[PDB]
Amino acid sequence: MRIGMVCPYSFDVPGGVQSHVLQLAEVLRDAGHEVSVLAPASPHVKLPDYVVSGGKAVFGPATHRKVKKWIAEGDFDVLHIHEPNAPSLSMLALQAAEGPIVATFHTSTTKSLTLSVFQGILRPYHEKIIGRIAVSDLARRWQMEALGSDAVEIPNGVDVASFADAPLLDGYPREGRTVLFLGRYDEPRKGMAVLLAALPKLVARFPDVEILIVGRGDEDELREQAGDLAGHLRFLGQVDDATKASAMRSADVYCAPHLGGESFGIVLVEAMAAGTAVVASDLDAFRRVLADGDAGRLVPVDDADGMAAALIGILEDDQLRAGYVARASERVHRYDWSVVSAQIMRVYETVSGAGIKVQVS
């Protein structure tokens, strides 16, 4: 198989979609397939030579040509499009392409905002997608309600062994204990304000806590907000993946205090693969990763003092924690790429046939 994939986002920054596409590509090549990845210009990062640039959004004419040419020249058995929002690189590809098209819908909000987008003026184009992948069962059911055709739920994957076998960061684990936060801490939806509001109760119990923070942001503003407790914040910046795996595996707990906006809790999966216990907001996506409290602690959404207690309960009860970790490590095999790339491949096989190729409309 020759598989064309389109990522709508630059690889210049980390994200769930970017990282899904690149690992999926790598995994597919290791099975003997040829994969070509189209994405916007990512000049700031070293990419393998199978990643092709769609240009920079200001998308202009050179990009429309590049997409038509990449399809026409690519000899693809399947075109796999990710997040075809309008406007986007993916949606451009979906409008230019004819034939064996697969789409993954990484995000959703509501039933209504799925029926309308699918059944609206972009319907003609959404109907061209022959294999439709949703990242949850409810999302999948919405797509089925919308267009009257079969969609499939397939979770995003991880490489479970790259966390499980990550080397510890130096000086770890710590005796005062660490809690990990990962993400762009200054979008409110990521819930840094909740972890911040829980720091005083945490610090009054573990007076040598560290909050290990992965992600880009304004350390100055957060330091200023932690007030007298800013000494407890250790910022790794936007670290690389191997150091991120090391960071997760050297923390005693991972804190996901998100306020909303999450369709798949992929960082939670990364913590479960690492063998690090999880404490999470309890958005619907986190509830399904953690299995209703079986593989991690779920805290109500905007609950500062419930979040303190949870993290304190996890850190002072070693058997409770070791339980989570052991249960989570059994379950996380669900998400491992060898499960997930198999499901995706059965979609590729459904959609494609003896010498049928993707062509330009």
Ligand SMILES: Nc1nc2c(ncn2[C@@H]2O[C@H](COP(=O)(O)OP(=O)(O)O)[C@@H](O)[C@H]2O)c(=O)[nH]1
């Ligand atoms: N290496 C690295 N990975 C990150 C960083 N931030 C997020 N990620 C990864 O990117 C993915 C996206 O999760 P998340 O960024 O929090 O969702 P999003 O930013 O809102 O798309 C997960 O695989 C994270 O481990 C970072 O600063 N460094």
